[PDB]
Amino acid sequence: REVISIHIGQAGIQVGNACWELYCLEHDAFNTFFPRCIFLDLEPTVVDEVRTGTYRQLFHPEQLISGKEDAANNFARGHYTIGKEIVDLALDRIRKLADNCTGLQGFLVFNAVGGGTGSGLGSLLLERLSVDYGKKSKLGFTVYPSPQVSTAVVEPYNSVLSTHSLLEHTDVAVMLDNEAIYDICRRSLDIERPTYTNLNRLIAQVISSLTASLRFDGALNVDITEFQTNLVPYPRIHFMLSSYAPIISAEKAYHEQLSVAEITNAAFEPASMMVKCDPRHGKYMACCLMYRGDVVPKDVNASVATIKTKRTIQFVDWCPTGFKCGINYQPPTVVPGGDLAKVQRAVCMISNSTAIGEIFSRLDHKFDLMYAKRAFVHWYVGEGMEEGEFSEAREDLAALEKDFEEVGA
Amino acid sequence: MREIVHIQGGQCGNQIGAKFWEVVSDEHGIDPTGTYHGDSDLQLERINVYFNEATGGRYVPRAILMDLEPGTMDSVRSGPYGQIFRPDNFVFGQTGAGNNWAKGHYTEGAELIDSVLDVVRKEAESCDCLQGFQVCHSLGGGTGSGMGTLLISKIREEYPDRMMLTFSVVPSPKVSDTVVEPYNATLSVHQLVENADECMVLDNEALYDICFRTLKLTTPTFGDLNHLISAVMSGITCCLRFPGQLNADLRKLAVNLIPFPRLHFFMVGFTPLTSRGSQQYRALTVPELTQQMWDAKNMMCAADPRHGRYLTASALFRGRMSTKEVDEQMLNVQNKNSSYFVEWIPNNVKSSVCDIPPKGLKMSATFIGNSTAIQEMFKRVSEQFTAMFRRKAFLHWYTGEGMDEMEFTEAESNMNDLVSEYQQYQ
Amino acid sequence: MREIVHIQGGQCGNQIGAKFWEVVSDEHGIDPTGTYHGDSDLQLERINVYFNEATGGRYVPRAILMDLEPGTMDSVRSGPYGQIFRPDNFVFGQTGAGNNWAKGHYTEGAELIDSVLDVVRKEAESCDCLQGFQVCHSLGGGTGSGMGTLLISKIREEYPDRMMLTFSVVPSPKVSDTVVEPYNATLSVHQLVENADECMVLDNEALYDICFRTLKLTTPTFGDLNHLISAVMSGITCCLRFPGQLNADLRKLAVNLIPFPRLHFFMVGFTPLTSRGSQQYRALTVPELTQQMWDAKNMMCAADPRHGRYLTASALFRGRMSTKEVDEQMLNVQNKNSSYFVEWIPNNVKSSVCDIPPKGLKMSATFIGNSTAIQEMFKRVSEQFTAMFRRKAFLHWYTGEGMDEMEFTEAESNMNDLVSEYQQYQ
Amino acid sequence: PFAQALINRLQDEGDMLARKIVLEMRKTKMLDQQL
Amino acid sequence: EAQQNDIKALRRELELKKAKLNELHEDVRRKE
Ligand SMILES: Nc1nc2c(ncn2[C@@H]2O[C@H](COP(=O)(O)OP(=O)(O)OP(=O)(O)O)[C@@H](O)[C@H]2O)c(=O)[nH]1
Ligand SMILES: Nc1nc2c(ncn2[C@@H]2O[C@H](COP(=O)(O)OP(=O)(O)O)[C@@H](O)[C@H]2O)c(=O)[nH]1
Ligand SMILES: Nc1nc2c(ncn2[C@@H]2O[C@H](COP(=O)(O)OP(=O)(O)O)[C@@H](O)[C@H]2O)c(=O)[nH]1
């Protein structure tokens, strides 16, 4: 059993540069990863940093795909003009990666939707993967732009135009912001001046905690097909809040008494979500709890009972059994130079609720304001688009808002 | 990989470009004799963006000097970093225009523009993936403005997809060297609005004012002013030459700062800029760089941005810094000074971080604000232009060369409709 | 965290502040270069209150020098610890008021005070949590009194919820350096009673008396007077910089010593202050500090408190001491001389101890008493003001600048009702 | 000459800004009761 | 010369008023 990982863009392969560092440091159990990867980007600067880095010999030279020139924060450019010449080479490699494989669980894609490469050719890669395989799962861990913290200007245009394909192509989509992670590193990790490297290190922790069930034998294992049923009650509602516990420094960890009861609680407070949204406004549709390390089924069982009996958070009226647990034996590993201390046990929670319906509504106004005056539209239209797909992507998010409001009732 | 061909025109262009190639050659560690002598590995792998390996480690710049008077060429060849250019690239007329835009655009350009195009073509296809061209000229002179402007139009006809940067200085009445400044600048802008991709506006008032107030220089010759302009140009194309935590090429900045195709006149600033006596009395943090960036008395144009609103803004950072501090600082200035920014655009600031500082510094920054205060100069120019043209002063020096009255009226028309669209979007 | 921005105005302010920054920097172990060279880790914990780290151990003082003649600015940069101030904090006019309160408050202030305000804003926003501002100036001169008082009024309407100390020497007939001293003092005090949170009265007469008897100095230049004043300022704000068994901050002192919003004029003394001939014959215990503290011939004003009544009093102790001894000494001096204290307030003395002595001594103290005898100065000054103003002496230098006659009558009324209102609570 | 028109533009803009400042004061004074 | 003084006074007043407006806007955002 193996699962291969695709990384797109400046954000994608930097996340991968930390994720693969953790995989090699963690390791027959290796068979699911050893790498079965592909980096691809339009700007050669970040890929060729890997080609000369410490992991020169680790990656086969062909694997590291690199175009000639960047899409430059332009969804249309990275989806219609420049994507068309590189995407064919990428997926015609990924095929022979799958032919190397025999028991493919799925693919997992890493991209940020704000940019052009992460968004544009992300969706383009996804569309040819869906028509080629269809049944095989493709987990997409995307990075959406934050409400108030922002680096680009045209990112609302990109985020809406990317989402329109992220609905019906990916199977399980995990949101991740930058402000929420910045807040996590500021609050729990007490790092007052964080950079992208620290963000990517703890993103890898989440990925590792949800594939450790395939790699190592636990008391209750859970495959990628399991998330497919247990968390998405409707074919078009798959957008997951993420959380992790205990995110804790090296000194505080020894002082505190980490156990199963309190980390099940800590994984539920909005002070520890990976996406800037308040689930107090929403109702939980389903929750999924990956437990790693020193876990007996009793205290995880007792912990979900206390959550259900609390009234600070509510569930939908549909699910009395609104949980999916999972226990694995091997504890989480640490990276030298990393900030997370060694813990006997950790919890990665992936939920689904209606709080996500707020982020789309928040997104709508920013896109709406700019589009009404036709700001920046001339860049995308001359690239090959029209006014049709702007308006039609707009009404797709309008439908999604009504959808969440209907299901939440 | 990505390629930048350099083109310099006129006296202003040649001397600005001379100081430019001095600082770039030092950044890549190339000696005045043309051979590599740097220390870090990082300085080798991205010199093809600016140089060509000839033979025996001879790295010659990919530049084209262009003028009509030999004084500038000989002064270029005389000084250091003067023996690094290919003598075939010194394309050079002989008669001279002399602050007559008509000479540099219809009569004398007609016999030089053929030779420059031959050199720039052979120099363009010599490299594989062109990123764009980079022009440094003026709008007051004749052989800089007129010939350089005509060269911009011909280049955009041949290569319509490739990028185009123009560092152009504009005349102001407080520093007025020639008498026919309005006649030249108005006609030059008429061609810049339709031919260039983006124009980073400069001026001598702000440059002299900057060296007085902030730098506190005693005798600011053209060397120091050209040194400042070169530091801006190195900062704008540091992303191609060095790896960073967030990259932003030329096209990336262009699409994030230009919301409408005719709105491509920028203001520029460089930080940090401190007096030599106070260089050790200061920290080097991101907030300090931001306070000096958003100061209205720090733009390198004589147009106060607080007289209007910013449409967009850009900040290219260089150095080991935390991206969170970058975004928090940009958000902070976006909330406290809410009236100076446009409302129907949230996020008026694009940011980027490169990992290699300029030589000698720890952390630097470059600001490019596309504001609506730039329209004051166009009005500040058009009022002078009408003052002459109501009464046909100096007009015959251009009329007997080919321009008719409709050309000047067309230049007034384009200037007037432009200032109305900046006023519209404010 | 708790922060004090320092402001020095006029010639009097500049020498006082100069000797002050030497004393504090020497306490924190910073050499004239401005780099850290101390040993104890305790000295580094609380340098955010007065300094900013620049780079490589360089600590810059959080002070602003403000004057009108460059003689004082150059005399500051010449002396030791002169190279530590940031040269941009030397905000500075050029013409000169010259002992004319109207010139200091209406003509030259109107173009210099925007500049000094802008520096203060940067210095206030550069830090996080303001505790207050600290202004040292005189009341006889013009560039200190009128400009400094305008600065006080402008700042108080900007940040109204923060404390503010002002240390002001006041004129007296026995030390009469200028001729228009009352015309300056009366108008300055009128503004201080309505703007400043608390004032600390000083005078040059008492300082000369201290240097004669207690110090027994041969040649008391201004350096020694500024030395005494600096020791007082360091002593009062020692609590924020060092931990102790009973800490008392500036706001804690203000609310404990001011019973009514208009009664905020204090007289200050410092101990131990002994001559080198008798410093060898002395002992260091709490009773010897108190009976030298509460002596009338040790106050730094020419207002003998036994000619009035004490409202409240305060003592700030420094050094490893026993708090029982501190409290019983305050109890003894209040029970014996019960008549000198106000009757409707028991336990008139606020006391505090800090565990870091100044360098060169084992144990020290600082006394701040809010008596009612301060009205001797108000009557003593107002009669000289009346003696000239009944006859319109020197008036035209004030009148011809913008001031009219009702300004003097209003100032007379407010000073006169103030000494009347001190007398009623007496 | 042209400064005569500049004074009109600056005067009208200053007056309109006062109207915006006035309305905003009522807004903050309205939220302060709700708090 | 008179009209020039009028220009440099109206802009300064305009500038002060714009700064006050920003303060009010900031307070509304924090209070909301
Ligand atoms: N978590 C995380 N996010 C990143 C990182 N680098 C970039 N991003 C995000 O990526 C978004 C912009 O896209 P980029 O990845 O930088 O660039 P791109 O997706 O390759 O698109 P192009 O610039 O056209 O090449 C920004 O909003 C960032 O939030 C990173 O290292 N870690
Ligand atoms: N910054 C800078 N400006 C210059 C320099 N030389 C000329 N200028 C400006 O250029 C304008 C005149 O342009 P000119 O040299 O006559 O252009 P040309 O005749 O077409 O080559 C004047 O306003 C100068 O201020 C220089 O070396 N540096
Ligand atoms: N303690 C002290 N007082 C001073 C010093 N220099 C001047 N003065 C006092 O300042 C008063 C005159 O004020 P002046 O210096 O002219 O104030 P300014 O002109 O406003 O700066 C005199 O009464 C002096 O007692 C000094 O070095 N120490």
Ligand SMILES: [Mg+2]
């Ligand atoms: Mg990118």
